[PDB]
Structure 1
Amino acid sequence: ATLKDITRRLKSIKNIQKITKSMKMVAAAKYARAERELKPARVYGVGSLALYEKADIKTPEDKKKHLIIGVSSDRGLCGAIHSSVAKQMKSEAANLAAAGKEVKIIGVGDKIRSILHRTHSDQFLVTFKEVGRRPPTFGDASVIALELLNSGYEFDEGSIIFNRFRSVISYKTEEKPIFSLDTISSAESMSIYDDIDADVLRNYQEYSLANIIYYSLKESTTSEQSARMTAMDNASKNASEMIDKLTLTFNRTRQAVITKELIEIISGAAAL
């Protein structure tokens, strides 16, 4: 292009690089805080899951009501966080419907809703937004569980998909089963537990639902902040390479313009 085109492009890319550096720093701070808050929530959620893996509960193979919960955020620029979760959700939903089930979906975060608003647009039991603006609390998980129970879709089996945070550079997508008390009552491993009618067990199921949702929220937010830090770092690096190339081009063009104007002056002077 001409010199002004190159100058404007170079200035724009420089601004973009500045912004991405700042956002990487912000995301890194929020990540440090999220890890710090994730350790205790990690122990708490693992404890809350203790029972089911200790008293092995097999879901009944004769029920059609299933629930899929997919945990993400509203924020973008986090790489393949929402993408992986939505991909696995549609995989599992397709499998369930091929097995002849009646799947619903809860989307914790806009981006999940958006990715799945073309297909699975009618299975949305309810979706939640305003995620990711502030670190998730137990209040959020309590609200999600409360609106899941209140909305009278009594499900017979459940699953939650979140991005388990492995390391600052890596994360994995999990699927943690959720059971309804119909499956806990009729489980022979549960015959050993004492002082257990079908009412205390119902309160216990409601609490465990809140617990698992909260655990998934903490893991997901940690992994998302890590991914946003990585994505911003890569974007800043790409902007730096582009800035180098455009600076070289700008210098070439500036010298060429100087030479062109000077040759015009010389030709005019010698052509008198």
Structure 2
Amino acid sequence: ATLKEVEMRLKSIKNIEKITKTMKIVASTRLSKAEKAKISAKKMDEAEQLFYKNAETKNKELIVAITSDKGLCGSIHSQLAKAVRRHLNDQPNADIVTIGDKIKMQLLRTHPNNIKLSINGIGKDAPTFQESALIADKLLSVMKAGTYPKISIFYNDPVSSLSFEPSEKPIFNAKTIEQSPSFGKFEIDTDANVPRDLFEYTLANQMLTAMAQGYAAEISARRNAMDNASKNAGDMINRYSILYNRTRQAVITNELVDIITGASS
């Protein structure tokens, strides 16, 4: 009654606890592979960035942002949402390309005008070159990315294994590459299509890395969140346990009193 309604509710809490435990462990499992990938990806990125640094490439605009289809992976969604909004005060009329549903929903509310391209099916997998390449190819063809001589991408840098700081970086347009001065301290033919190629190649290489950084933060966030969930659920187990014990005793006593009263008569 009380006892049974307590008991089912405590059971619900128990089932939740079990799930949050299971999920948290599996999150840890997923996290190890994710981190491994991110290293290799980041190493590749650094080699290209080495060119861009040495080149000192410098800089409507594009905003690209990434947050997976799936949720319950901390505040990745909303910290990134807040930082997009901050940089949407830096150009109100900028065109937002949302890579994955979760960031799509939040920004779509904040400005629905700016949502121009969006990508579904992101969250399912761990980042891959195939995805990055096609998203890029579509960014070039569909969004005519080069027209906007500022491109900036947002992702979640997994700052520490317990933290994530939403981060952005600037993708270097072919125009930037052209007019960067220490571009001239590297050499290739004028008949080369290298400005238009090199732009494209780092559009994708940076994007894949951005996705990888984000994905690791996502899986990490999910581990953190599910861990904190287990703790919160445990506390609820304890609160309902005391209630259960008290309720159980009270029922025995009250029923007994009735039996006694009857016997007394």
Question: For the superposition of Structure 1 and Structure 2, which TM-score range results when normalised by the shorter chain?
Answer: over 0.9
- Tell me which of 65, 72, 78 is aligned to 2:73: 78
- Note the 1:244-255 alignment, pairs <5 A: 244-255=238-249
Tell me, what secondary structure is at the counterpart of 2:88? helix
CA distance in 2, matches of 1:249, 1:152: 59
- Tell me which of 78, 83, 91 is aligned to 2:86: 91
Q: Per-residue deviation at 1:253? A: 0.2
Q: Per-residue deviation at 1:190? A: 2.4
Higher mean C-alpha deviation, range 255-264 or range 192-201: 192-201
Tell me, what secondary structure is at the counterpart of 2:148? coil
* Partner amino acid, structure 1, of 2:138: E
Higher mean C-alpha deviation, range 169-178 or range 217-226: 169-178
CA distance in 1, matches of 2:202, 2:246: 66
- Tell me which of 129, 151, 161 is aligned to 2:154: 161
Task: Give structure 2 stretches of 5+ with no counterpart.
Answer: none
* Partner amino acid, structure 2, of 1:56: E
Q: Does 1:260 align with 2:254?
A: yes
Q: Per-residue deviation at 1:5? A: 1.7
CA distance in 2, matches of 1:11, 1:73: 32
> 2:40 maps to which residue?
40
How far does the alpha carbon of each residue in 1:8-34 deviate from its partner, in whole angstroms, 9 at most, with x for none? 110100001111111111111000111
* Partner amino acid, structure 1, of 2:82: K
Q: Per-residue deviation at 1:73? A: 1.1
> 1:216 maps to which residue?
210
Q: Per-residue deviation at 1:163? A: 0.9
Q: Per-residue deviation at 1:195? A: 2.0
> 1:62 maps to which residue?
none
CA distance in 2, matches of 1:58, 1:38: 26
> 2:223 maps to which residue?
229
Task: Give structure 1 stretches of 5+ with no counterpart.
Answer: 60-64
CA distance in 1, matches of 2:175, 2:39: 33
Q: Per-residue deviation at 1:110? A: 0.6
How far does the alpha carbon of each residue in 1:117-172 deviate from its partner, in whole angstroms, 9 at most, with x for none? 21221212211122232211111111110110011432110111111122221122
* Partner amino acid, structure 2, of 1:194: E
- Tell me which of 103, 115, 118 is aligned to 2:106: 115
Tell me, what secondary structure is at the counterpart of 2:94? strand
CA distance in 2, matches of 1:227, 1:17: 18
| Percentage of pairs with the same residue | 41
> 2:62 maps to which residue?
67
CA RMSD of aligned residues (A): 1.5
Tell me, what secondary structure is at the counterpart of 2:122? coil
CA distance in 2, matches of 1:49, 1:127: 27
Higher mean C-alpha deviation, range 260-269 or range 195-204: 195-204
Whether the aligned pair in 1 keeps the contact of 2:153 and 2:169 (CA below 8 Å) is yes
Whether the aligned pair in 1 keeps the contact of 2:16 and 2:233 (CA below 8 Å) is yes
TM-score normalized with structure 1 length: 0.92
CA distance in 2, matches of 1:80, 1:230: 10
How far does the alpha carbon of each residue in 1:184-203 deviate from its partner, in whole angstroms, 9 at most, with x for none? 22333323332243722101
- Tell me which of 131, 139, 142 is aligned to 1:148: 139
* Partner amino acid, structure 1, of 2:210: S
How far does the alpha carbon of each residue in 1:85-114 deviate from its partner, in whole angstroms, 9 at most, with x for none? 1111111111223xxxx4111111110001
Tell me, what secondary structure is at the counterpart of 1:160? strand
Aligned residue pair count:
262
Higher mean C-alpha deviation, range 191-200 or range 108-117: 191-200
* Partner amino acid, structure 1, of 2:166: T
> 1:206 maps to which residue?
200
Q: Does 1:170 align with 2:134?
A: no
Tell me, what secondary structure is at the counterpart of 1:95? coil
TM-score normalized with structure 2 length: 0.94
